[PDB]
């Protein structure tokens, strides 16, 4: 069956750093861009919406403009990787990755953000 996996289900990231959280899904030798739909959400915020080989920025929440992107080259490897630069404290929480690719699945990932003076 179509299953989405997460290598790590809890990310502890430092304030102001860059974060890359990854969901893995099965891909054959070649990637069918028409069939792939990827949606990264947190709380009720539209982070990344990926359809027909391109990110849809018209629905992206303002909290993430030029702050987050889907690394398209990793999709070739069966990796939906969300990268968010300059992590803020308001980026901590539960992220959901939803992937449709023939079959459909989704997984949760928890992100803790470390305060600047916590280490």
């Amino acid at each position: 069956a179509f299953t989405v996996t997460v290598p790590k289900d809890l990310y502890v990231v430092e304030y102001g750093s860059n974060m890359t959280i990854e969901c893995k899904f099965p891909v054959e030798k070649q990637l069918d861009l028409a069939a792939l739909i990827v949606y990264w959400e947190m709380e009720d915020k539209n982070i990344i919406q990926f359809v027909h080989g391109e990110e849809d920025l018209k629905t992206q929440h303002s909290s993430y403009r030029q702050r987050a992107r889907l690394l398209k080259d990793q999709l070739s490897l069966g990796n939906a990787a969300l990268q968010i630069t300059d992590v803020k404290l308001q980026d901590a929480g539960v992220y959901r990755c939803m992937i449709s690719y023939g079959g459909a699945d989704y997984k949760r990932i928890t992100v803790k953000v470390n305060a600047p003076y916590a280490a």
Binding site: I37, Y39, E41, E43, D44, K45, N46, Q49, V51, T59, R96, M98, S100, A104, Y106
Partner: peptide, 14 residues
């Protein structure tokens, strides 16, 4: 998130 029924019930964006 709109798109018909694609991941119906899996998301919270309205």
């Amino acid at each position: 998130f709109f798109x018909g029924d694609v991941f119906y019930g899996w998301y919270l964006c309205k």
